[PDB]
């Protein structure tokens, strides 16, 4: 009875980073270190906890946040980092204990002529708080004149898309990202390693 890692990591559709998805896995066995030795993952990095010795450590629940960004932004899914993905899309706390797993998805998330299905927030009036999720479509007022929900000068649609095409550099190619947040509550037990 162990948690569906197979179709969180191999899920066919991934979410856009502004509307990142979260799966809360509970009440199962888990084996993490057949995953720590990547071969498939270009990034597997951990914070507060360490990949070693963790099939022997436990928590009360597991949260799996999954989305897609461009390569040059995977360096932003870490505690204390800045940029428009960390500021306006997905923010990890400074006290983060968990991990970050990322792999290249160019062969399925790109398209010739551009895949415009993956979006990201590029305008917002203030940075996100840790694990906050904003899917507002409100017109962004970048000046003194109000917008009244219609786009114009200094009034912008806050989202924009990536347009992944297979001929891009790896820094602009689609990377699928899954973040695992571990639950320490003073309460019962849940998901553990073998």
């Amino acid at each position: 009875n162990l948690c569906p890692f197979g179709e969180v990591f191999n899920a066919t559709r991934f979410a856009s980073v502004y509307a990142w998805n979260r799966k809360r896995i509970s009440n199962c066995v888990a084996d993490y270190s057949v995953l720590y030795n990547s071969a498939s993952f270009s990034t597997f990095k951990c914070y507060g906890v360490s990949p070693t010795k963790l099939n022997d450590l436990c928590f009360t629940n597991v949260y799996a946040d999954s989305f897609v960004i461009r390569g040059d932004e995977v360096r932003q899914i870490a505690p204390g980092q800045t940029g428009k993905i960390a500021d306006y899309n997905y923010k990890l706390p400074d006290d983060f204990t968990g991990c970050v797993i990322a792999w290249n998805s160019n062969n399925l998330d790109s398209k010739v002529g551009g895949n415009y299905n993956y979006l990201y927030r590029l305008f917002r009036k203030s940075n996100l708080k840790p694990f906050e999720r904003d899917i507002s479509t409100e017109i962004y007022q970048a000046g003194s004149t109000p917008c009244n929900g219609v786009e114009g000068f200094n009034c912008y649609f806050p989202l924009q898309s990536y347009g992944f095409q297979p001929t891009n550099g790896v820094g602009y190619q689609p990377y699928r990202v899954v973040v695992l947040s571990f639950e320490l509550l003073h309460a019962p037990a849940t998901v553990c390693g073998p």
Partner: antibody, heavy 122, light 111 residues
Framework: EVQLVQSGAEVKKPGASVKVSCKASGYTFTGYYFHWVRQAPGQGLEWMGWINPISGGTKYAQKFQGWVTMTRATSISTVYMEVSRLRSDDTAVYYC???????????????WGQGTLVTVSS | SYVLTQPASVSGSPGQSITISCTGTSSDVGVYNYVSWYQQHPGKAPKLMIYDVSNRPSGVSNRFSGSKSGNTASLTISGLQAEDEADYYCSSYTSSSTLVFGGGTKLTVLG
């Protein structure tokens, strides 16, 4: 190279409807707003409106508001200009052009479609 | 029918320089510098000749000059030749993020 390719000419009878297509290629389709501009034969250019490809938000000139609709499909990177219940006033060439950017910056049209002639007669 | 006021016909002889006026309101050519100038040869799509009042796209010959003063933009062609014969439209953005055009100017060259 940036390419805006429009549909072929259309001849229609009054009271019918027409949907001109304009497919973009060679650049990020969501990056720039699109302008629709009509020109009756022998006459000048008339701004019909603009559409934002990623939000679908539109703004029509007051002359064409209500009886014209602009739409887009980013799956195919195409914008559509549809006028229904034609009159013979509507015999004209219809142009799409790439306009300003997502943040309203490069406010001009450098790339135009070849033009679609729509001839409405009984 | 709000359009930028533009002379219907101008002309001039080869080697000389002509200028085409285009007069707007406070709300467009007066407040912003998003004026551009398109050239149309009969039967083809308009070609961007000048943008941002004075800037020429790549490939447009230096003979095409842009200028703006008050509410009146104007386009100057120096060393007029045969193939400059065409329709010329001014256009500009407005303070309500709308686009407007001019009436058009047919330019013929004498001789």
């Amino acid at each position: 190279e940036v390419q805006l390719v429009q549909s072929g000419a259309e001849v229609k009878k009054p009271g019918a409807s027409v949907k001109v297509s304009c497919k973009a290629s060679g650049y990020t389709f969501t990056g720039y707003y699109f302008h629709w501009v009509r020109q009756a034969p022998g006459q000048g250019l008339e701004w019909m409106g603009w559409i934002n490809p990623i939000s679908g938000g539109t703004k029509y000139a007051q002359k064409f508001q209500g009886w014209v609709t602009m739409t887009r499909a980013t799956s195919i990177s195409t914008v559509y200009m549809e006028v229904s219940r034609l009159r013979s006033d509507d015999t004209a060439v219809y142009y799409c052009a790439r306009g300003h950017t997502y943040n309203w910056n490069y406010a001009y049209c450098d790339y135009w479609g070849q033009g679609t002639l729509v001839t409405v007669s009984s | 029918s709000y359009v930028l006021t533009q002379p219907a016909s101008v002309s001039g002889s080869p080697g000389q320089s002509i200028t085409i006026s285009c007069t707007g309101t406070s709300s467009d050519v007066g407040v912003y510098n998003y004026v551009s100038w398109y050239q149309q040869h009969p039967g083809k799509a308009p070609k961007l000749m000048i943008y941002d009042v004075s800037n020429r796209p790549s490939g447009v010959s230096n003979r095409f000059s842009g200028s703006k003063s008050g509410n009146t933009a104007s386009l100057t062609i120096s060393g007029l030749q045969a193939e400059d014969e065409a329709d010329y439209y001014c256009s500009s953005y407005t303070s309500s993020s709308t686009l407007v055009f001019g009436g058009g100017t047919k330019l013929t060259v004498l001789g």
